């Protein structure tokens, strides 16, 4: 079990959604890279594990379930089984990364990525020990009804570059957005 990342789109206002929705307008390149980035292994016969919230599973397009290629767990406090096209269930965040120590997952898994939600984000983000964000910053105020949780830049560090990640400001429908890779180490 290789590396732990965070994976979020956010306004400036740090929103991340509402009415279980994304509070822009659907961006097609902002999606291939989140796709992209959670899919991708960098070792053979590995694949990358996806963990999120109930209400983060719910809210893709059930065409889009589960995410393909990669191993697909949900995390509840009130749910006995895992949700239709889901793979695992735990009731923690330390119940999933125990569960990847598994022989189960254990030889199957690279990267885990934390797509969602606000509660899922913000305990992954206290966790102790190595921990990178991937940060798309869309420029703009969007209403929303769920928030990305204040990054501690004294214990983040925004990183200059990133092999695979653009550094330049792309746009799409009108928008501005940019991405932005933090690493910690505590
Ligand atoms: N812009 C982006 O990058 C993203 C945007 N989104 C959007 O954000 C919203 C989804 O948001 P959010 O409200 O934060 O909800 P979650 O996706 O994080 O779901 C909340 C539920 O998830 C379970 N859960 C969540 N955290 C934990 C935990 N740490 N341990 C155990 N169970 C946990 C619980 O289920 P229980 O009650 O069942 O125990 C909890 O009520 C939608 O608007 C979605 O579209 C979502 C992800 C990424
Ligand atoms: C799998 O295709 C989709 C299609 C529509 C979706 O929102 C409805 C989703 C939801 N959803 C999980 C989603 C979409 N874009 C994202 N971008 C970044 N940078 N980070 C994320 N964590 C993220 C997550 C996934």
């Given at each position: 079990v290789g590396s732990l990342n965070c994976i979020v789109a956010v306004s400036q206002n740090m929103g991340i959604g509402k009415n279980g929705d994304?509070?822009?307008?659907?961006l097609r390149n902002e999606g291939r890279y989140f796709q992209r980035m959670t899919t991708?292994?960098?070792?053979?016969?590995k694949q990358n594990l996806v963990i999120m919230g109930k209400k983060t599973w719910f809210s893709i397009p059930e065409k889009n379930?589960?995410?393909?290629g990669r191993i697909n767990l949900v995390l509840s406090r009130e749910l006995k089984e895992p949700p239709q096209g889901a793979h695992f269930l735990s009731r923690s965040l330390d119940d999933a990364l125990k569960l990847t120590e598994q022989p189960e997952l254990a030889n199957k898994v690279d990267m885990v990525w934390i797509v969602g939600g606000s509660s899922v984000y913000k305990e992954a983000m206290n966790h102790p020990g190595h921990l990178k964000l991937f940060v798309t910053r869309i420029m703009q105020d969007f209403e929303s009804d769920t928030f990305f949780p204040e990054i501690d830049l004294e214990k983040y560090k925004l990183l200059p570059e990133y092999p695979g990640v653009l550094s330049d400001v792309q746009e799409e429908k009108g928008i501005k957005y940019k991405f932005e890779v933090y690493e910690k180490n505590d």
């Open positions: 994304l509070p822009w307008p659907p991708t292994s960098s070792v053979e016969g379930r589960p995410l393909k």
